[PDB]
Ligand binder design. Structure first.
Ligand code: NDP
Ligand code: NDP
Ligand code: SFF
Ligand code: SFF
Lengths: 265, 265
């Protein structure tokens, strides 16, 4: 019940949004653990540098495939190719997001649509394409989310919408896999403010809050996903998982199954 | 304050998904109250029947515009036309959903995108198009959701993702409207199982649960929206709003505003 880095030695892992931030940090940890990694982002040069560092850090293998997660064809084909490169898949880390800026929502449809497409729809595309490989290996999916995917805050209406959608979709999948006795685990990672350049830049002169270090955040995601935890909370305050954990919802979800015809599962 | 039907006499109301189920019942209740209504759904014939009955029931005026909410152009233009018809807008009822059957997740991306566009994107398009008129009248928006938009249960992963996304988006809009002193209210109506023809048919052989009556459901939505409540819970069990209400998220959302720069609003 306690994490050991050997749990990832020789494992076949995908990390999306791996050129910088938490994604790049996750690729490094996995590499030090001796895992096989396939990395993605739009930046070829950014991916080349991470792959090269991963190989130095002890990765069993490291490859990159560049493209945009706004294209559902690329998202799906990326899974198929990553799977063929490693000869299977043990863990899928859905980490990427499209660019978001803090602003009161005002006449901004186009941004809600592109945000929903990248932040949510490509996550559905990739988890669907990856599932047969994860079923064979009794794999895991880490779904990266935020406090804004469990509560609301001003200035992030499109982003919050997409992260709430991930919770609604992925918690239904987790339960469906559990009740059908499919040994594939789903870890929703609820992250507080992290000290990546993107998050720090985006809140500059808008929000004044303490950030958590990106390195430790990355390790916690990997550990919680390896341990098959339903949810991982990572924030400075110890109150965050207590206040966002929603025990009422958990009680309702437990009793919910009693109403279904057992034959469906 | 208590709701009095006299509050809605002469008011200008839009109802979507008004050809059947709770939408139809809401059109009837508003008609009885003496409101002006503009109804929409795909069925021209279905809407013609509801409109005639609305007129017989005492509506100040009753009109319909048929079309599909998969088309964002129709969603927006409908709001503009409805506005022209009544000479303004006081209340916007966002009630439509796509056809939803219960199955363990197995849809392709085209099917999930369609659910996200109809159940979610069209609500964002319409609430955005209606905002100048609602700002002029100090109007209201009712966003129809379900228990599956506050917790998860098997066999409705896309539907649940779409309803969670509505909580995420609209709760952010509500807080933004509040902090900028805009007197436009937003009511998220979290509904339990309702005895509609569609819901009863879809659960046949799958779920055995107590349904609540459609005409009381309809009235409860109207009452809570007119009263400008942030959320309305409508279900047989009194444990439902207690267990789904999430006091912890409310505590966090309250404390969250203190991190922000006042000058941004
Ligand atoms: N940082 C924080 O404070 C917090 C972060 N999170 C979550 O952590 C995750 C990662 O966060 P973070 O590291 O800060 O963000 P970063 O901006 O640091 O990195 C995001 C990654 O996504 C990639 N990316 C951007 N646009 C696209 C696109 N269209 N297609 C494909 N890849 C894309 C970027 O690479 P490239 O530009 O080359 O494509 C980059 O590698 C997200 O899911 C976020 O919601 C949650 C809470 C707080
Ligand atoms: N009934 C229940 O148990 C529950 C219902 N709810 C919520 O209540 C609302 C309505 O419920 P209910 O009355 O049972 O459902 P119904 O199927 O009874 O009616 C839904 C309405 O949506 C219309 N519609 C369907 N597809 C489209 C489309 N593509 N574009 C435009 N309109 C469309 C339908 O008419 P047409 O075919 O003519 O277009 C119809 O008028 C939904 O938002 C649902 O989530 C929440 C919890 C439980
Ligand atoms: O911890 S969060 O809920 N998620 C995030 N997510 C970021 C949003 C901007 C781009 C990087 C990710 O940031 C925090 C600060 C802005 C408001 C929400 C909080
Ligand atoms: O009350 S709900 O959470 N929402 C709904 N929404 C309906 C889903 C089927 C078509 C009409 C709306 O139905 C209930 C029964 C099936 C599972 C979910 C619950």
């Amino acid at each position: 019940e306690e994490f050991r880095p050997e749990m990832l030695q020789g494992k076949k892992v995908i990390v999306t949004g791996a050129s910088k931030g938490i994604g790049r940090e996750m690729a490094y940890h996995l590499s030090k653990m001796g895992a096989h990694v396939v990395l993605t982002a739009r930046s070829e040069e950014g991916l080349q540098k991470v792959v090269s560092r991963c190989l130095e850090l002890g990765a069993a293998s490291a490859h990159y495939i560049a493209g945009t997660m706004e294209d559902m064809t690329f998202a799906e084909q990326f899974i198929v190719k990553a799977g063929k490169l490693m000869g299977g898949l043990d863990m899928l880390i859905l980490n990427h997001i499209t660019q978001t800026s803090l602003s009161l929502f005002h006449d901004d449809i186009h941004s809600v649509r592109r945000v929903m497409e990248v932040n949510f729809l490509s996550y559905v595309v990739m988890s669907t394409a990856a599932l047969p490989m994860l079923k064979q290996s009794n794999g895991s999916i880490a779904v990266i989310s935020s406090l804004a995917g469990k509560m609301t805050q001003p200035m992030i209406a499109p982003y919050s919408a997409s992260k709430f959608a991930l919770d609604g979709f992925f918690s239904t999948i987790r339960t469906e896999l559990y009740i059908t006795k499919v040994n594939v685990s789903i870890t929703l990672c609820v992250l507080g403010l992290i000290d990546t350049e993107t998050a720090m830049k985006e809140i500059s002169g808008i929000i004044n809050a303490q950030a958590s270090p990106k390195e430790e955040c990355a390790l916690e995601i990997i550990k919680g996903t390896a341990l098959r935890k339903s949810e991982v909370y990572y924030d400075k305050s110890p109150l965050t998982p207590i206040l966002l954990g929603n025990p009422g919802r958990k009680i309702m979800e437990f009793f919910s199954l009693r109403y279904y015809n057992k034959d469906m599962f």
